[PDB]
Amino acid sequence: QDGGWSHWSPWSSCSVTCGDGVITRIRLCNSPSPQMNGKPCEGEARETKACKKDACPINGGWGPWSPWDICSVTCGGGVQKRSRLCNNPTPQFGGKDCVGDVTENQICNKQDC
Ligand SMILES: *[C@H]1O[C@@H](C)[C@@H](O)[C@@H](O)[C@@H]1O
Numbered sequence: 001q002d003g004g005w006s007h008w009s010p011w012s013s014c015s016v017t018c019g020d021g022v023i024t025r026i027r028l029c030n031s032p033s034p035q036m037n038g039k040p041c042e043g044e045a046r047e048t049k050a051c052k053k054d055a056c057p058i059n060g061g062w063g064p065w066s067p068w069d070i071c072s073v074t075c076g077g078g079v080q081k082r083s084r085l086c087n088n089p090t091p092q093f094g095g096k097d098c099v100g101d102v103t104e105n106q107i108c109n110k111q112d113c
């Protein structure tokens with residue numbers, strides 16, 4: 001009794017919901033399975049195909065902070081600024097916006113005036 005392949009199983013769904021992945025389907029050497037010294041089934045027991053979905057969301061990421069602006073003062077109470085860019089990367093395909101402020105403030109040179 002030589003082995004015989006069962007019918008293919010239904011194709012699975014895409015391995016991913018976005019971007020590229022694969023759909024798989026399987027067979028069993030059980031229709032009939034091989035007996036002792038009978039020929040085993042010839043071929044593949046699994047078949048992986050490829051599926052392509054829409055691009056995955058790209059969440060925003062902050063770029064480097066700009067250098068601190070020079071202090072508005074040399075003694076008592078200064079305020080210097082600093083800025084950011086949400087373009088490393090820029091949000092795309094429904095990705096989340098960067099979290100946080102685009103600009104930063106801080107007191108400086110607050111000392112003996
Ligand atoms: C599965 O992957 C996530 C990241 C989103 O792209 C969903 O829309 C998709 O179903």
Ligand SMILES: *[C@H]1O[C@@H](C)[C@@H](O)[C@@H](O)[C@@H]1O
Binds near residue numbers: 073074075113
């Ligand atoms: C700037 O502030 C003035 C008042 C002086 O104290 C300078 O020495 C400082 O750089």
